[PDB]
Structures are given as structure tokens and as C-alpha cells.
Amino acid sequence: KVFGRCELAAAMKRHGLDNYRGYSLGNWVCAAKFESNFNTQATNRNTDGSTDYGILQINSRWWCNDGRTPGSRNLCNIPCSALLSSDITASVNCAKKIVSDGNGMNAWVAWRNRCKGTDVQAWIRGCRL
Ligand SMILES: [Cl-]
Ligand code: NA
Ligand code: NA
């Protein structure tokens, strides 16, 4: 599924991401835009052989099991394919564990390089939330 911007904002809010660990909703929408272009089916392979999955590009070396990342931890205890669903629940629940692990949203390279320090509230401007 490819979300609209406000559609995704509303889904993320309903799933408790607004201000989760202090990160306003715009941060999450911005990260999703640049990680996946709002596409739940996005996948990208990394140089170390791990793969990133879904709207928030969650990595198989630490967070989910895709059966082909040797020595990987499955800290969200989910198959990586569950992160590609049109229902973003599994991605949101895993993202909450990631953002609580010490480094905050810096875990998402695109957030660090393209959202951090910008006016992220623009990502939810105009939305009926
Ligand atoms: Cl980047
Ligand atoms: Na893909
Ligand atoms: Na992989």
C-alpha cells in the first residue's frame, strides 16, 4: 500500500506514535517519506547482507527474521514479511522498541540526514487529525 501523507499521519496517531518518546508526529511522517516514500512494500538490501523492510525500513540484522541474515537478532520477534503489510501495526510496534533503545530516532539514517533539525510539523500541515 502507498499511503497518502495525511492518511499515514492519521494511522500513526491512532497507533500512538504522536509524541512517542518525545518525537512529534511530523518526525515519524518525515522518516516514512524518506525511508520508503510511504510504500509499505519497500525493501532494500544492505552491504552486510541484511535487508530493510516496510514503511520504516526496519533492518533484519537486529529487528526481524527474514531467514537469510545469519546471526541476526529478531528483537521484534516477527518475520520481516509482516512489516510489509498494508496494516502498519507490526511496523509501528517494532518502531516503538527501536526508538526506545537509547539512540532515539537517530537509528533511522534518513531521519537523521533529512528530518532532524527541520520544520517537521510541515509534514502534518493541512491534515484533519
Ligand atoms: Cl540519508
Ligand atoms: Na520491495
Ligand atoms: Na536479508
Distance CA 44, CA 109 (A): 13
CATH code assigned at 114: 1.10.530.10
Query: How many structural domains comprise the chain?
Result: 1
Containing structural domain, residue 30:
1-129
DSSP string covering 46-88: -TTS-EEETTTTEETTTT-B-S-STT---TT-SBGGGGGSSS-
Distance between Cα 60 and ligand 3 center (Å): 6
CA distance 89 to 83: 8
Give the span between the Cα atoms of 112 and 11, in whole angstroms. Answer: 23
**What is the whole-number distance in angstroms between the Cα of residue 84 and the centre of ligand 3?**
14
Residue 79: count other Cβ atoms within 10 Å of its Cβ. 16
The catalytic residue among 7, 48, 52, 119 is 52
Rounded distance from Cα 128 to ligand 2 centre (Å): 30
For residue 83, the ligand closest to its alpha carbon is: 2
Q: Is 52 a catalytic residue?
A: yes
Method by which the coordinates were obtained? X-ray
Q: Catalytic: 35? A: yes
Resolution in units of Å: 1.7
Q: Tell me the CA end-to-end span of the chain in Å, nearest whole number.
A: 20
Distance CA 66, CA 72 (A): 9
Coil/strand/helix, residue 20 = strand
Alpha-carbon dihedral angle through residues 103, 6, 41, 37, given to the nearest 10 degrees? -70
